[PDB]
Swiss-Prot record:
Result for mutant: residue 282 to A: Slight increase of the hydroxylase activity
Catalytic reactions on record: calciol + 2 reduced [2Fe-2S]-[ferredoxin] + O2 + 2 H(+) = calcidiol + 2 oxidized [2Fe-2S]-[ferredoxin] + H2O; calcidiol + 2 reduced [2Fe-2S]-[ferredoxin] + O2 + 2 H(+) = calcitriol + 2 oxidized [2Fe-2S]-[ferredoxin] + H2O
Superkingdom field: Bacteria
Chain positions covered by the region annotation Disordered: 1-17
Gene Ontology biological process terms in this record: vitamin D3 metabolic process
Cofactor(s) this protein requires: heme
Name this polypeptide is given: Vitamin D3 dihydroxylase
C-alpha cells in the first residue's frame, strides 16, 4: 500500500475557497501537529489547530530565519540580507520600527481618500471600455500597486517592470527564475537609493535613505530587501484577496446581497473573507532552535515547522461550522495575518483596501459576474500566495 503518515505538503486548491482534501484530513486528525514530507523529501511538522498555532507563533524558540539550512522550504524557489520578516528579536524589532510610521491607524485613515480615488479611477477606465475585462490586470493588481508606490516613493511609471519581476519572484517554480527576478528588483531599488542620495524624496524609501541609511543604522542591501518585501507584499497579496473575494462572494449570492443592503457589515465580511480564504500559508515557516514539547508531541531543535494558518482558521472549536462562509459570524482571532511579533505589518492597509474595493464594486458594478465558469479558472498552487492570475468578468454596460 501507498498509505503514508507524512503526506506531501503543500496541497493545491481545486476550489478557490475550499480546503484541499489533504488539508481537510489534517484538520480532522486530532492533535496540534502532523508530520509532512516537503518537495525535497525532508520531513517537517505542520501546525493544524488554532490555539496551538498562536502558541507556536508566540514561541521565540521557533525562529523566522530563512537562511537556516533546516528552514522548511516548500519549493525549489526558496533556494542577500533578510528583511525583518526573516529576523528574530532583538534584530527584528530594530528593523521593523524603521517602517511602522507608514502603517499606523492614523496614517491608514489619512490614506482612505487616496485609496478611494485610486479605486474609482481604475473603475472609471474599466467601465468606460466595457466588458469583458480581466479583473486582475485591469483592477485587482493596479490598485494596490499604485497605493504602495506612493507609500514607498517608488515611481508608478515603473509598474510594468516591477509587477512582472514581483510575479516571477513570488510564483517562480525554480531557483534560477527566482534569483533573476530578485536581482532585477534589487538593482532597480539600489538605483532609487542613489537617486534619493542626490535628491532627497518622498516615501518610505526616501525616509530610510535620508535617516537610517545616512546614520549607518541599516545596511544598504537591507534597505533593498526591506523595500522589496513591502513592494511585493503591498501589491501581490492584496490583489489576490480582491480576486478571490469576488469569486467567493459571487458563489454566495445571499451573503453578497445582504452585504450590499447593509454596508455596516463590510468590516465583518472582510474579517470573514480573510479567515476563510487564508491566502498566505507560504509565510508560516519556522525552524526550531531548541526542543519544544507540544501536547506530548516533540519538536526537536533543527526541525522545520510550518504554521498552516488556513487550516488553523478552519478549527471548529473556534469557528462553529468552520467551512461555512458566514459574514455575520465572529471571525475574531483569525490567523490570516499571523500572530505575535511578526503579525502582518500591512494588515490594516489590507483591511482598508478590501473595504473600499468591495463598497466600490457594489456601488458601481452591482451586475458584476464571472465571464467564465469557476471551474475554468486556473488556481495558483500551494507553493505560492493563493489566487488566480486571470479573472474574466462581465457586467451591464452603461454607455
Ligand atoms: C490580505 C493581504 C495580506 C495577507 C493575508 C498577509 C499575510 C501575512 C502574514 C500571515 C504574515 C506573517 C508572516 C510570519 O509570521 O512569518 C505577514 C507579515 C508581513 N506582511 Fe502581510 N499580508 C497581507 C498584506 C500585506 C501588505 C499590504 C503589506 C504592505 C506592507 C504587508 C507587509 C507585511 C510585512 C512587512 C510582514 C512582516 C512583519 C514582520 O515580520 O514583523 N502584508 N503578512
Amino acid at each position: 500500500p501507498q498509505t503514508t503518515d507524512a503526506p506531501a505538503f503543500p496541497s493545491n486548491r481545486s476550489c478557490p475557497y475550499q480546503l484541499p482534501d489533504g488539508y481537510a484530513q489534517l484538520r480532522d486528525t486530532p492533535g496540534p501537529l502532523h508530520r509532512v514530507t516537503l518537495y525535497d523529501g525532508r520531513q517537517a511538522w505542520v501546525v493544524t489547530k488554532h490555539e496551538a498555532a498562536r502558541k507556536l507563533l508566540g514561541d521565540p524558540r521557533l525562529s523566522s530565519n530563512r537562511t537556516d539550512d533546516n528552514f522548511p522550504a516548500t519549493s525549489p524557489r526558496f533556494e542577500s540580507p533578510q528583511a525583518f520578516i526573516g529576523l528574530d528579536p532583538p534584530e527584528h524589532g530594530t528593523r521593523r520600527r524603521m517602517t511602522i510610521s507608514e502603517f499606523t491607524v492614523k496614517r491608514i485613515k489619512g490614506m482612505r481618500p487616496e485609496v478611494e480615488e485610486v479605486v474609482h479611477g481604475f473603475l472609471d477606465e474599466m467601465l468606460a471600455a466595457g466588458p469583458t475585462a480581466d479583473l486582475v490586470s485591469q483592477f485587482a493588481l493596479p490598485v494596490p500597486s499604485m497605493v504602495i508606490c506612493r507609500l514607498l516613493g517608488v515611481p508608478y511609471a515603473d509598474h510594468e517592470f516591477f509587477q512582472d519581476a514581483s510575479k516571477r519572484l513570488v510564483q517562480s517554480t525554480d531557483a534560477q527564475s527566482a534569483l533573476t527576478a530578485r536581482n532585477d528588483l534589487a538593482g532597480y531599488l539600489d538605483g532609487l537609493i542613489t537617486q534619493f542620495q542626490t535628491e532627497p524624496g518622498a516615501g518610505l524609501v526616501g525616509a530610510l535613505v535620508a535617516d537610517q541609511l545616512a546614520n549607518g543604522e541599516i545596511d544598504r542591501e537591507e534597505l533593498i530587501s526591506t523595500a522589496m518585501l513591502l513592494l511585493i507584499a503591498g501589491h501581490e497579496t492584496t490583489a489576490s484577496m480582491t480576486s478571490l473575494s469576488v469569486i467567493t462572494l459571487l458563489d454566495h449570492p445571499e451573503q453578497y446581497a445582504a452585504l450590499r443592503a447593509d454596508r455596516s457589515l463590510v468590516p465583518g465580511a472582510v474579517e470573514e473573507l480573510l479567515r476563510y480564504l487564508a491566502i498566505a500559508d507560504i509565510a508560516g515557516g519556522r525552524v526550531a532552535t531548541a526542543d519544544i514539547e507540544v501536547e506530548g508531541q516533540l519538536i526537536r531543535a533543527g526541525e522545520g515547522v510550518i504554521v498552516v494558518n488556513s487550516i488553523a482558521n478552519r478549527d471548529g472549536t473556534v469557528y462553529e461550522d468552520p467551512d461555512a462562509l458566514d459574514i455575520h459570524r465572529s471571525a475574531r482571532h483569525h490567523l490570516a495575518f499571523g500572530f505575535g511579533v511578526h503579525q502582518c505589518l500591512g494588515q490594516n492597509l489590507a483591511r482598508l483596501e478590501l473595504e473600499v474595493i468591495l463598497n466600490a464594486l457594489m456601488d458601481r458594478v452591482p451586475t458584476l459576474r464571472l465571464a467564465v465558469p469557476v471551474e475554468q479558472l486556473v488556481l495558483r498552487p500551494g507553493t505560492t500566495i493563493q489566487g488566480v492570475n486571470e479573472l474574466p468578468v462581465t457586467w451591464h454596460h452603461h454607455h
